[PDB]
Write a protein that binds this ligand. Structure first.
Ligand code: CLA
Ligand code: CLA
Ligand code: CLA
Ligand code: CLA
Ligand code: CLA
Ligand code: CLA
Ligand code: CLA
Ligand code: CLA
Ligand code: CLA
Ligand SMILES: CC1=C(/C=C/C(C)=C/C=C/C(C)=C/C=C/C=C(C)/C=C/C=C(C)/C=C/C2=C(C)CCCC2(C)C)C(C)(C)CCC1
Lengths: 330, 141, 338, 339
């Protein structure tokens, strides 16, 4: 991390996560504990919402945060209205609870067995050591992470047409998108009118072009080191690299907050909720057009308004890190 | 706009009372002349002229022309009284010239007071109008 | 700036924008953030107007000023003038919001990451450094900006001739201007009746003649610097170059206020509102032809009366800055009254 | 400028305009700003009263003075003496107002950038440096100004004959005049009935005869210096030449106040109003014939009764400066009444 005008800062108990920023072993252990808590949140709150799910009522009024996402992928949906099966939603949250214990096992593994710095040990273990000033291994980490997100977008391509189908909100009996709209001219013009989607062949075809770009750039960052022009304009520091991802996540969060309240095809109001509108003013928040029965907010309202505030606090959290990485103030 | 002030020509209270206006002087048509002169003003519900002093030039003769005519005369009285008091102060006996006014010196100052605003601006610019605070008798705080 | 008598003068927080007049790096950072704030207004208020747009009423009376400019281009109507598609209004405000984030990036780049003075940089950062005493570098900046303005005027006439055409009010439909104007006798005669133009074909050939002129002046200012004709008659101070641009944009703002009051073709009446008689009172203004309910002034009257007051005060700011550049300290007036 | 022998007269703020009377560059700057303020009033108040103009009513009763001036020249007038075009009043009111901005810029140029004294300047400004006690330089200034006044009177004759047409108050139409008078006897006969000419073809021919006289007079003043008899009988001080100008423009004010009130040709009654009766009270004033109520004073009673007072108070201003130029100290009044 960026030490403020010196070499080593002895951080206090309040800023306790600034202490291990130069430690490679504790960097792995803290980050896979975040993924353990993310897989626990994906797993335990899947089963939490099953226990509070009434299929007679509307699914949007019960605050389902993970069930309409699983209904969008098509794990056991019904064309006659309400979702029929429950065990596909049960096994997905049970798998994430298993993977949270596996990721939680790796949280304590690199905490205690591994040292704080991954250079004391050897034997194909010193290769998994990174330094914030060294560009070569950071391109290896970025190249390998983009290979999984390239495969993650390819896994949706495997799911849509080799391993199942995708729920289409118009036909209501999936679509099973086999050959999508693979047009480079369509996806280039879709930079602006992305608020509403009319066909999911653009979604499956968009994930083809995103995934091939991600696996194309993933294998590119593996082969070559970072260039000198990227070293010149971008600071290669601990807080600087954090500021680059915190800017992109907050950019992704603001898009995800806007895409929740305005989309009706990949976010169908059958089980997500009716769409919303942006209420500008002192607090820009998304307010429900639909009238909830007794002082409630729907799932689309809860997803959009939380992700707007979380990306805003990431935006202000990026300003605390980017001004510190440049050494401008505080 | 004065929506509660009708003009006196169209005010029925004034129109029923202007026919009984008394004569203030020896002229037997003094009340008739006052009835025509006060018709151009603004009247209230009781038919009497209500004057407007806010600064409108339609009602400039209500206050502004009285203001210009007064301040010229009152400036004249103040300026010739100040200039006579300065002139007799330089004499051997300034005290006796106030209870026994030098009348030819007083008439000389009083006829010269028609150019008081030009003399007041010039004396303010010369510093002889306003005395400095260090040169004035002062209370012991 | 001016540096009255002695140099190394300091400015307070109410005049703190004048401190970076000699700093080239911070001069970029303030101006690009102005273009970031300008493109943010061009994008967010395109979204603000389309959220408040109702197609039942007319275009001008609702208080929307941005979308009539795009409808004049032919990007809001297909037939009738009712404005039936809001998709080309969405692509413009989203692009200007993207470009404002790009211009917001480089502006904060030049005030925190890049140095505040470009004279300490090496490579292309030394070639971008400028000072307010070198006319050769100021001719490089002016010549390259004049190339961009000439390309901007050519892209309007290029779109009007080959990429869709403009909205012609006398036929109420979009049309191609594939036969342009190439005789400069009619442009020279348009100095008098410039604002009473009733020809879309003559307007496009004007921008062809304008756009070919500002690239001619753009090329001329690059390969030839300012010389002894221009150095002796024009001051080259920090506020002197600002003063010429202040009156230069006030002259443009006075024409644009007058062109937004009597024109019917580049400002169609069904998009902006009816043309206005030129009134004058304590100050000049362009009053409405008819009194709309709850005194809602039309978008044509909101554009013309605001651009008149902006151009008057920018003329007054030109007078403040030209007096400050020439050497008047605004304190000799009080010292003469003594 | 009269200094009463004292070379170091400081002057107060109320007489602060006397400080630049010996400074040639600052003399230009105040006068050009006066022409900036004069052309601004010709421009802004043409546009002020075209907004206040009601075409149904007569413009005389509305209280407008600049639109009847342009309507008498023949702009915006149809076949019945009405007003149908608001555009030529807008163009001329714009042209005067833009030219005031050029003059307002050139006055600030001669205040700030140009030197206070033009003897310091090298080039053509050294030739423009005038001193008050140089009669040869002043006739060059006077002769060039007589050329533009002669060109202005020929332009009005040019506007009536060729570039448009004047208004005919007898036939209530805009008439292009053709072939005005050339005999000098009728213009010499117009010294008596100058205010009752009632003829366009003699008004233009009179303007031809004074346009050729002013240009020929400006030829004589540029080429020939003052001979010496005028130096003996007329003073050549700064306040002396101002005294002759204030006296000369007071006589022009008294004529134009009288010519506005009684003449119907150059001041038509459907543009201005009925010809005013020459009344007199505690002051001379030309009163309304028709006597429109509610303090109307229908726009010829404003032109004539302002150009008499402004001529009277320039006649008083001519007397203030000619007394100053001849050597009256004006403080000797105060010592006359002293003991
Ligand atoms: C990608 C995310 C990211 C990462 C990895 C870090 C990492 C770092 N930041 Mg941080 N930062 C971010 C985002 C991030 N930040 C955001 C979101 C903010 C805005 C709030 C900031 C603003 C910030 C400040 C102000 C500080 C840092 C500092 C730190 C360092 C130590 C932090 C620590 O010990 O935590 C300890 C954490 C706590 C004690 C918890 C805070 C207490 C709050 C009130 C708990 C409740 C939070 C919230 C209300 C809960 C809502 C729940 C709801 C969502 C359901 C570390 C290098 C510190 C530093 O470098 O010192 C100069 C420092 O002082 N950052
Ligand atoms: C997502 C939540 C989370 C995660 C998983 C991490 C992860 C990490 N923290 Mg922690 N921390 C958190 C949030 C988190 N923190 C919050 C919000 C606070 C602010 C209240 C802190 C404040 C804090 C302190 C004060 C320090 C850590 C340290 C550690 C690292 C070493 C732990 C270790 O090896 O144990 C065994 C311990 C050691 C080998 C020596 C480390 C020194 C002490 C004993 C660590 C224990 C502090 C504290 C009790 C940890 C729990 C905090 C909180 C979850 C209750 C570990 C990787 C340490 C660090 O950065 O490593 C250098 C450090 O000193 N944390
Ligand atoms: C950030 C995530 C991530 C990354 C990239 C690392 C990185 C590393 N692990 Mg690890 N691992 C993790 C998560 C991760 N682990 C989790 C979630 C588990 C499952 C419980 C483990 C359990 C594990 C074992 C059992 C071992 C490694 C080992 C290694 C090292 C060499 C890897 C290898 O096979 O060499 C080629 C390296 C430090 C070895 C090591 O160095 O341990 C300290 C080792 O013994 N890993
Ligand atoms: C293109 C525009 C331009 C440029 C770049 C400059 C540049 C500058 N001028 Mg300025 N000037 C101009 C035009 C311009 N001016 C205009 C139009 C005016 C006329 C009003 C002036 C009058 C002027 C003065 C009087 C002074 C300068 C000063 C300054 C300097 C510091 C300014 C500062 O810190 O702001 C500080 C800004 C503020 C404190 C904010 C004030 C905001 C007010 C209230 C206006 C708000 C807008 C208003 C509500 C209208 C809204 C319109 C609506 C459409 C949104 C700087 C060199 C100073 C200088 O050179 O001497 C040191 C100085 O004293 N200028
Ligand atoms: C359109 C809006 C606009 C933009 C684009 C800028 C642009 C600029 N301003 Mg600014 N300014 C503006 C409006 C604007 N201002 C207004 C209206 C005010 C009146 C409140 C000022 C008053 C102001 C001051 C007082 C100063 C600037 C300076 C700066 C420059 C560098 C700031 C920096 O990094 O600090 C680097 C600063 C230092 C290393 C030390 C200076 C200490 C001052 C107090 C820092 C102030 C910076 C501040 C965040 C700028 C915005 C002010 C306000 C709008 C919040 C930057 C190019 C600074 C400058 O000229 O740089 C030398 C500076 O001193 N401006
Ligand atoms: C429009 C105004 C403008 C101008 C005058 C410059 C001028 C400059 N910038 Mg640039 N820049 C700006 C805005 C501007 N930028 C914006 C809008 C961005 C895009 C986000 C950037 C991002 C930026 C980067 C990426 C870099 C520069 C750099 C440069 C320098 C050389 C650029 C070059 O060779 O061009 C061809 C020069 C000082 C470089 C420099 O000198 O930085 C220290 C540098 O690293 N700028
Ligand atoms: C039609 C209106 C008019 C015009 C165009 C002028 C023009 C002139 N006057 Mg001026 N003035 C006028 C009205 C006018 N006056 C009236 C109404 C007053 C009485 C209040 C005065 C009292 C006055 C004073 C007290 C002085 C002038 C002087 C000057 C000159 C100042 C600029 C100069 O030479 O820079 C160079 C000037 C200087 C180096 C010193 C003077 C400093 C400032 C610029 C004086 C400006 C005072 C200002 C004009 C008062 C405004 C009055 C009114 C318009 C509101 C200029 C040639 C000055 C002069 O001739 O000095 C050489 C002088 O001292 N004026
Ligand atoms: C009608 C009154 C008047 C007078 C007598 C002067 C007198 C003069 N002008 Mg001029 N000038 C005036 C109005 C006037 N100007 C106005 C209205 C403007 C704006 C168009 C200018 C702008 C102007 C410029 C910009 C220049 C002069 C200069 C000249 C000088 C003679 C140049 C020459 O022979 O041109 C042939 C002399 C000081 C020149 C000079 O010597 O000044 C430094 C000069 O640079 N004039
Ligand atoms: C605006 C009017 C104007 C002004 C102010 C002057 C001023 C002057 N002229 Mg005149 N002049 C003018 C127009 C003007 N002229 C025209 C239109 C003509 C007729 C063609 C002449 C032909 C003329 C002659 C023939 C002579 C003068 C002379 C004179 C001087 C004596 C005046 C006189 O005869 O008293 C009564 C005086 C300085 C005399 C002189 O010596 O010039 C200085 C002289 O001999 N003038
Ligand atoms: C020298 C001097 C002075 C003086 C000055 C002056 C007083 C002048 C003035 C000047 C001026 C006064 C100028 C002018 C200007 C003008 C303006 C500035 C205007 C504006 C406007 C415009 C330009 C336009 C208009 C229009 C038109 C024409 C058409 C229609 C539309 C519109 C309305 C837009 C003084 C004393 C201060 C001081 C000392 C020195």
């Amino acid at each position: 991390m960026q030490t403020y005008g010196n070499d080593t800062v002895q951080y206090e108990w309040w800023a306790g996560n600034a202490r291990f920023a130069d430690q490679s072993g504790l960097f792995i252990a803290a980050h896979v504990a975040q993924a353990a808590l993310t897989a626990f949140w994906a797993g335990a709150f899947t089963l939490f919402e099953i226990s509070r799910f009434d299929p007679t009522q509307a699914m949007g009024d019960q605050g389902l945060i993970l069930l309409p996402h699983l209904a969008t992928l098509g794990w056991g949906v019904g064309d006659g209205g309400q979702i029929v099966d429950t065990y596909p939603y049960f096994v997905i949250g049970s798998i994430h609870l298993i993977a949270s214990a596996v990721l939680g096992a790796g949280a304590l593994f690199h905490t205690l067995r591994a040292p704080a710095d991954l250079s004391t040990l050897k034997g194909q273990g010193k290769k998994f050591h990174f330094t914030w000033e060294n560009p070569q291994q950071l391109g290896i980490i970025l190249g390998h992470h983009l290979l999984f997100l390239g495969a993650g977008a390819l896994l949706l391509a495997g799911k849509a047409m080799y391993w199942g189908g995708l729920y289409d909100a118009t036909t209501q009996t999936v679509r099973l998108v086999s050959q999508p709209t693979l047009d480079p001219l369509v996806i280039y013009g879709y930079q602006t009118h992305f608020a509403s989607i009319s066909s999911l062949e653009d979604l499956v075809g968009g994930h083809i072009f995103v995934g091939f770009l991600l696996i194309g750039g993933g294998i590119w960052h593996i082969l070559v080191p970072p260039l000198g022009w990227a070293k010149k304009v971008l600071l290669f520091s601990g807080e600087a690299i954090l500021s680059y991802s915190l800017g992109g996540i907050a950019l992704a969060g603001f898009v995800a907050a806007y895409f929740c309240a305005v989309n009706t095809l990949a976010y169908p109001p059958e089980f997500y909720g009716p769409p919303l509108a942006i209420k500008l003013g002192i607090f820009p928040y998304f307010a429900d057009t639909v009238e909830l029965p007794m002082h409630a907010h729907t799932s689309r309202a809860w997803l959009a308004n939380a992700h707007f505030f979380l990306a805003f606090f990431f935006l202000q959290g990026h300003l605390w890190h980017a001004l510190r990485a440049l050494g401008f103030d505080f | 706009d004065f929506a509660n002030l009708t003009p006196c020509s169209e005010n029925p209270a004034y129109l029923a009372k202007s026919k009984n206006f008394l004569n203030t002087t020896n002229d037997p048509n003094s009340g008739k002349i006052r009835a025509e002169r006060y018709a151009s003003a603004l009247c209230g519900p009781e038919g009497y002229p209500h004057l407007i002093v806010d600064g409108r030039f339609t009602h400039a003769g209500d206050f502004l022309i009285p203001s210009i005519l007064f301040l010229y005369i009152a400036g004249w009285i103040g300026w010739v009284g100040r200039s006579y008091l300065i002139e007799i102060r330089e004499s051997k006996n300034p005290e006796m010239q106030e209870v026994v006014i030098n009348v030819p010196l007083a008439i000389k100052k009083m006829l010269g007071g028609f150019l008081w605003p030009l003399a007041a601006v010039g004396e303010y610019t010369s510093g002889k109008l306003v005395m400095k605070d260090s040169e004035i008798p002062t209370s012991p705080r």
